[PDB]
Amino acid sequence: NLAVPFFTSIPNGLYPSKSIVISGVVLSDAKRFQINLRCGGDIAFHLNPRFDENAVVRNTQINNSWGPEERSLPGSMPFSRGQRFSVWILCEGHCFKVAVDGQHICEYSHRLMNLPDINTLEVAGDIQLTHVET
């Protein structure tokens, strides 16, 4: 079942060289969607395209408190309403590397380093989810 909100395990948690791939289609009336890599009560990595803001927000939530957002992009907004997408998240020792449709869009330095405990993937929001690899 690929209904959203979608949850699944990341076997063995995160470690350097582990890849997560999220494929789907942005809804034509989308406001936002989110991909969360969760550990317990924290969100290690929140990847959050916002179509009203024309932004891709990255952040971390610890004990229910959000940190400072990261929003830098090398070019234009890499998701579009109604458009198919493939998100590739690569875990390294110091950061996540994120590509969309093969285009590198950002690095995000780890704020939570307990990588094996980051063992739940959540995908939620205004998309049709078509494939997950964890």
Numbering used by the authors: 12 to 145
Question: Paper's wording?
Answer:
Galectins are multi-purpose effectors acting via interactions with distinct counterreceptors based on protein-glycan/protein recognition. We report here the first crystallographic information on the N-terminal extension of the carbohydrate recognition domain of rat galectin-5, which is precisely described as an N-tailed proto-type-like galectin. The overall fold in ligand-free and -loaded rGal-5 is composed of two antiparallel β-sheets (F1 to F5 and S1 to S6 strands) that form the characteristic β-sandwich structure. The presented data shows that the N-terminal extension can adopt an ordered structure and shapes the hypothesis that a ligand-induced shift in the equilibrium between flexible and ordered conformers potentially acts as a molecular switch, enabling new contacts in this region.
Ligand-free full-length rGal-5 crystallizes in the monoclinic P21 space group and diffracts to a resolution of 1.7 Å. The core of the different protein units can readily be superimposed onto each other, as revealed by the low average root mean square deviation (RMSD) value among them of 0.26 Å for all Cα atoms. Differences are attributed mainly to the N-terminus, and the six protein monomers can be divided into two groups, based on the experimental electron density. In the first group (chains A–C), the 11 residues at the N-terminus are not visible in the electron density map. When inspecting the second group (chains D–F), the electron density for this peptide stretch was clearly observed: the three amino acids from Ser2 to Ser5 form an extra β-strand, named F0, running in antiparallel direction to the C-terminal F1 strand. Residues Thr6 to Asn12 are in a loop, placed in parallel to the axis of the β-sandwich and protruding more than 10 Å from the S1 and F0 strands. The conformation within this loop is stabilized by interactions with symmetry-related molecules: hydrogen bonds between Pro9–His142, Tyr10–Glu103 and Asn12–Gly52 as well as a water bridge between Asn12 and Asn74. In the ligand-free structure, a network of water molecules or the presence of a single glycerol molecule takes the place of the core of a cognate glycan in the preformed contact site. As observed in the hGal-9N structure, a short β-strand is formed in the ligand-free rGal-5.
